[PDB]
Amino acid sequence: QNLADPAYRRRRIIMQNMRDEELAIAQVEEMQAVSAVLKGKYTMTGEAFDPVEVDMGRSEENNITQSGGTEWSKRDKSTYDPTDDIEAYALNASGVVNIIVFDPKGWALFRSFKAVKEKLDTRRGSNSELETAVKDLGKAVSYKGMYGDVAIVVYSGQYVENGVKKNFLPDNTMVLGNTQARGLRTYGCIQDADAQREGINASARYPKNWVTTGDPAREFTMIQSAPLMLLADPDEFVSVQLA
Amino acid sequence: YHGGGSGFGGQLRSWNPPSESVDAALLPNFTRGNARADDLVRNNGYAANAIQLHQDHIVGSFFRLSHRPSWRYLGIGEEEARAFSREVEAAWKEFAEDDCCCIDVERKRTFTMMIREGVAMHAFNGELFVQATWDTSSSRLFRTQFRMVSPKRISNPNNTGDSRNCRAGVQINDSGAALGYYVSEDGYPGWMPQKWTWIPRELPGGRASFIHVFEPVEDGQTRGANVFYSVMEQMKMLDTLQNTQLQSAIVKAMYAATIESELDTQSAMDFILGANSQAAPVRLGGAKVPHLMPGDSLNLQTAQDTDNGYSVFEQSLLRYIAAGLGVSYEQLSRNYAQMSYSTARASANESWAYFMGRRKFVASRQASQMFLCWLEEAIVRRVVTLPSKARFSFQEARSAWGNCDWIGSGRMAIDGLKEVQEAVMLIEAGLSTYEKECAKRGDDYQEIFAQQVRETMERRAAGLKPPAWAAA
Amino acid sequence: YHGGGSGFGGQLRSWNPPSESVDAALLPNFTRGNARADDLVRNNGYAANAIQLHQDHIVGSFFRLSHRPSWRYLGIGEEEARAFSREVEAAWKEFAEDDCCCIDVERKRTFTMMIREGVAMHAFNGELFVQATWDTSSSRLFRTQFRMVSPKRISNPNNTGDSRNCRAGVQINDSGAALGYYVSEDGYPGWMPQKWTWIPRELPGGRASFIHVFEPVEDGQTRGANVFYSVMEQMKMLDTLQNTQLQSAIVKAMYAATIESELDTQSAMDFILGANSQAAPVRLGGAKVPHLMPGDSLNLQTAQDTDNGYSVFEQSLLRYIAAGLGVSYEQLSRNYAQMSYSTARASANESWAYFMGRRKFVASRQASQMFLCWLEEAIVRRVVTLPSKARFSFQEARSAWGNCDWIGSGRMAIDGLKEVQEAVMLIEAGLSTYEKECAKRGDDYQEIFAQQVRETMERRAAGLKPPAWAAA
Amino acid sequence: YHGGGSGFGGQLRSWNPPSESVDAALLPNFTRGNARADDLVRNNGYAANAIQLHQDHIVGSFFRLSHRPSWRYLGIGEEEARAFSREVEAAWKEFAEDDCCCIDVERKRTFTMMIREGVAMHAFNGELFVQATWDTSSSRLFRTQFRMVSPKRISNPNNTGDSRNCRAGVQINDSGAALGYYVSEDGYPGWMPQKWTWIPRELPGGRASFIHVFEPVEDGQTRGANVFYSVMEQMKMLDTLQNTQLQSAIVKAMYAATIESELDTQSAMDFILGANSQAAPVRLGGAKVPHLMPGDSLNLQTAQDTDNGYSVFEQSLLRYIAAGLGVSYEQLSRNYAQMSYSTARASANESWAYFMGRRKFVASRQASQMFLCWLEEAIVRRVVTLPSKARFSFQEARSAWGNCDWIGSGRMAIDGLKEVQEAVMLIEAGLSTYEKECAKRGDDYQEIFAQQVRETMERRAAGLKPPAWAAA
Amino acid sequence: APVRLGGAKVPHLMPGDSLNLQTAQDTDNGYSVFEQSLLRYIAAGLGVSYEQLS
């Protein structure tokens, strides 16, 4: 019923394209942002893009990865204090630490310890308050209560490369860090003669469209951003594999 | 009731419209409607004429202020109220009609021009927006400057879909009220606007930051609908009819003859039309009587009447269109067929009621909100001094302090003498005062009295006889 | 709403005009639009009449100055304000209306001529430009000289593609305001290519150095749109129709008769039409009766009606064009069909509303800015002296010192007696002053009073009767 | 905007006019346009009638001077100014009304004739030239003389092209103002080649030597364009249509019969027409009844209506032409359909506005410049004397000393009594004065007062009743 | 297949083809007068005058 002239249909189709372009650019920005934190460096590559490799010097003493010794899975789930290692890992950071980010598998591994359970129900031995029970099951982020001083965060975001969905954080990593860490959000200069004729430069998401008068007609649409995500102090975080 | 059935003999079995609110019937095709309305306004003789009639008769050439604060309610005293009103009117007159045109940000218009543009925007768009902003770096006396916004600019951010609270870029709270508007920036080189900026309707201090004026039709109507929607189809179809008729008349009147013969077409025109081969031109001097052999034959085509009744149909369609738009058929079509005085006066009255309604609502509301937004800063910067012994401060009762009535241009009567006679006869009796009659001519009676008082002494200085109004 | 849908039966399926702002709808075809407007004005009977009506009714033959400074806002005193007004009016009347025509550098116009040119340019181009400059070589009292800049001159430099801040040769700052105008030199035959120069809108001292007048349609309109876009197509098509019809009438009336025979081409004309072989010319003296054989024949052609309904359809098109432009049909077409007094007065009112609007806006703004630009030299050059104890200096409130209202030419009434009776009866009552009544006839009332006060003395000296206005 | 686009259905795909100023559109084809307009003025009745209307209504039968120097600025005094004005008016009235026609070198005109010719030559050519020289050998009171130069003479020397500083025979300085003019020689015979001279516009003292009067349209315009360019084509085509229709009517009405037979040409006319053999003339007496054998026949040929709708088409074209020229339709075509008083008065006033504008600009400016050129001599040769204690010398301010107002012939009202009644009604009230009323009849109130003061004495001495205006 | 309404067109017909511009009757051939008669009848029946009814 209802229905519309072949022109309404063109306006609707034209929009959802704008939405998809914005979502793709936002995904690229977030992927750069996350990859800049987990490890010191991240590489930008493509099929038509000459590879460029941004590298911020992070000391080898960071990026702590568990090994045949000092791993949480193999060790007993009763009679063990996770809190002791956390302090040892966080000693390596420069500056205070005020937040912890868990991949949900890592969070399930961490809260399974009985000692951390004991730290919750002590009358005077701590001020930590968590929410061990289920809190969020559809949302991407779940701000759990402060554990001691630092806050506890579980992030399960999804970026889709090809048809298949993928998770951002790589399968139970834990990232110590500071909630006020100095991060830079740098946007370069767009390279389009039409844009520069218009007078615009160093802007994010310059949109345009044009008609190509081809055999089937056609008018396209294009967003171009040129993003670059930096970290002023790369060694303010401490990435842990936590296997 | 046969209205809601199938019809007389099943003729209305297809006409089954859905019952929808104004929002669901207007918003999905809002932009196309606005675009078509603007297209008609720009490129039609009748649409531009209708807009010009709106602007010239609703508002006119000058749009003046009369400040009347409610003295009894505020409990301040009559004479102090009059003095305050005089100071405020002087200040506004100084600020309203600045020749440098600094009242608007773009420095292209004066006040009454802004009112005229507001009326026009309310004509073919259904709504008008004025934004009141400050210039901190400005070193003149009054910082407040107003900026016009076309309704094309206020739309959703980043091409989002219409939601319960945000419709067509206008945010709506739980009730029907509005909180703020999303305004883009239309830039000429290229299209597909880039960024959207949020600006609220009211500052936390109660000051007006965004002015939205329109008349609703139903319960919940986020944005208005222009007046052209009743006659958008008929005007386009009439334009097509006129252009096609003109082209057809040109083509039918273009072929004046037809030559039938057997010889070569050059010699056929040489021996019949009268040309020379020294196709080919034919000189238009004198008269000619060609000589024809039996095979030859000459035809002088005759065409149809150039206006075979198009002029009568056009009259009917213009009557329909003028009924839709609001202006009388006589003003819209410039016809003015021979008629009596009674019919002319009746048509003028029936248009006048509509024009006065429009002026009393749209232009008056816009002007009053502008005046109040200026008056808040005027009081704050102490260019004027409020009366003391005030029950309510300025913030508590804003409309009681800035209650103003505007006087626009007066009607031009068909008869010059009759209107003067009737005004004089009302003056002789107690039916009407001086203010009503001097307002019907676009005049503030206080200024007239001051001019008369100056002139009587001017005359007495030169030795002329005192005027009639002079007291003995 | 069916306005924004497919339409009646899908007839409007292809009518999808793009929703674009005025800047993106005017500028891409600017020069061609202005050129077509000029071509229509330069080669049509009706367009030149419309321009002449605009010039003659908006302004007329004299455009007088009436200076009324705002003394209360400044606080100087009534007598000092009047002394200053009289002095400045005398100085301006000397400077404006010189017969040496040295107000503009080309020495070809007076002041009223310049106002009329401004109105005309605002008619068929949509915008007017005036450049105010100085001449240090001139030894006269006042060094101010003005100029008229054709809108074609001001364009983007070297035809470089358009930009964001610099649109169509007019520079725009971050807000909507304009700062400078790129204007080129114009030499028609050749020389070095056009050199585009910079001319700032206003000098550092606040003086106005470049003038641009046009009424906007939307929020942002960098350059104006002419009045002809509504009806440019129809006037061209009417021109084509009229020329084609006239040529067709000539062609149809040219071929008077027709001869069919079987003899030689000249013998048949010798024996039938009566020409002489002593084509073959025929003498028009007297009557003739040929002699024919069975083979021959003579036919007297009959042509269609020369004017078969073309007049009525031209009437319809002129009504449309008159609605589009603004002038009433009776003025544009010179028809003046049998109409009563009521219809004529109503049509005159319809024309006069628009003419008053244009006079109040276009010519008035140009004249006010010109007068202020001149008054700055005067005040500075001590040709006139400011009143004492001024609350503000001249540069602080320019509008305060130069607050002026201009008098144009009045209306020529359809019936002369009735308007005079109306004015007299209004004067007898208190509704209107002498200043307004004498202003509606284009007279300055102070000059009139001086005239009567001198005429009474002249009559007394010569021995005649005292006049009616004299005081016993 | 559809005006600047392709058009309705692509019909305006080829309407692409050049964008060029008045110079690039006028100078290449100046002489051809002037020659065609002169052809139309010389060889068409209607255009000559329009020119006569221009001459008679713009100027009339007299062009009187009224000298009103601005005495207030000069600081000289009212009484000295009045005496100076009287003296200079008397001197001008005696100089320019010489029965021997010695104002102009050619001794063929008077002042009023010269002003009328200036107006006419403005009308059909677009400019008027007046050259001011001296005849040193002459022994008269004034040695100033003026020669009228036709615009055709001003041309580039040696018929070369237009250089940057010399357009169309007029020198142009760095600004648009003119500096000097190139004048050819009057060559009546084709042979005797022409000599080109050089005439500076102003003598080094500032006195006017060569006068150029014309109204510009755009910024830079070396020479103007005449009023006929709007309707050059239509008048020629109308003339061709008229001549062709008249010739066709004569041809169609010539052949009153046609003879069919099989006998000799002589005998067939003998037996049927009734001619005599002693082709064959026939005498018209009586009514004749021929006798026809079976083979013969006689056809009385029939023609169409002679005037089938030609008059209404002539009406439409004449309305168009009149609208182009500026004269009212009834003044141009002498039609005068049955019309009420209101319509006639409306038409007369609509033409009168234009006529008053033309008189105020063209004739007034030319006469003022000529009068200033004469007043320099009067002052220098001490024929008249300047008021003593003058602030400025004459040369420092020519306009102030020579400021003058001219009065033409007054209009002839449609109704005789109503104009007089309104004049008396105005004079009785204060809305006007004696000078303005006496000026509307083309009279000077001072002369009327002198005549009345003479008449009252003449009546009193002779024994008659004193006049109405006489004082007891 | 839908035509485009813009323009003035002159078709080129082969000998077989043809084009017919139908002429219809007066869309109001005397209906107003019959309405007048019937409305006068109805007004006489109901009591209100003809002007006040029609």
Residue numbers in the entry:
A (entry chain h): 99 to 341
B (entry chain Y), C (entry chain X), D (entry chain W): 24 to 301, 320 to 513
E (entry chain a): 321 to 374
The authors write:
The portal occupies one of the 12 vertices of the icosahedral head. It is formed by 12 copies of gpB, which exhibits the canonical portal fold of phages belonging to the order Caudovirales. The dodecameric portal is located at a unique icosahedral vertex and facilitates the transport of DNA in and out of the head during genome packaging and delivery. The structure of gpB comprised 4 domains: wing (residues 24–249 and 368–452), stem (residues 250–279, 343–367), clip (residues 280–342), and crown (residues 453–511). The tunnel loop, which was previously indicated to facilitate the dsDNA translocation in the portal during packaging and stabilize dsDNA to avoid leakage during the phage maturation, was well resolved. The asymmetric reconstruction of the portal and capsid at a resolution of 4.0 Å showed the asymmetric interactions between the gpB and gpE subunits, as observed in the structures of phages sf6 and T4. Superimposition of the models of the 12 portal subunits revealed that a loop (residues 208–218) in the gpB wing domain underwent structural morphing to adapt to the portal–coat interactions.
The temperate phage lambda, which infects the bacterium Escherichia coli, belongs to Siphoviridae. The virion of the lambda phage comprises an icosahedral head and a long flexible tail. The neck–tail complex comprises a channel formed by stacked 12-fold and hexameric rings and a 3-fold symmetrical tip.
